[PDB]
Amino acid sequence: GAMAMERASLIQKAKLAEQAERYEDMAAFMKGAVEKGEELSCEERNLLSVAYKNVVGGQRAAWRVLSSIEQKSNEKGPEVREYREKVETELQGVCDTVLGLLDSHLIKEAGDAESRVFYLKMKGDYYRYLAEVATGDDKKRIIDSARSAYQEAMDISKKEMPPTNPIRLGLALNFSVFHYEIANSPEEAISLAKTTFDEAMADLHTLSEDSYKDSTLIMQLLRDNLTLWTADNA
């Protein structure tokens, strides 16, 4: 009917925006498709994720450039602060939009384990991107919201998914990053990454070639962080 046709058009425009590398457009198209009220397939979930991660990823990178400049420049006007705060506000608005969409349409008690873990991990991620720029009481609440979302996804993944499942691995990875970079819990970050890597390793011999590459892709990232974090360099 009308809903199906409209949804299909927005998905098609999201894919067109993807090919044109118009990620803000892509995100808005996927948001409209979500608001048609139907579940997202795996492919569509990834289109949604790609779009908003590209948008916020560009803002995060800009925010980090400006904070770095700010440090050394502040080592003289208010321009760097004002403009960094302009980028902050925009980044906060995009995360707010994603978090609202997750809460209003995507996070449900129903659905396979992958979908529920996917969206709750995504919720932890966008709260984590908010925490990167937050200060004060707002930061403490955001951090609590990130942890709560990550922990809920972790509970489901540990109960319903194998240790090698790439969505489970991706969640553990990001949660460990949260521990290290946001929650100020380096031992927990290192412990969680170590456990995730090891528990995955123990089951690799059972996987197909395609599953093996998907799992090992994230396992290398875990290793990469472990090597980074476990070093007397600083």
Binding site: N46, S49, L169, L173, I218
Partner: peptide, 10 residues
Amino acid sequence: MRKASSAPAL
């Protein structure tokens, strides 16, 4: 400490 790697685009 440089920023750690998070899950990639799937």
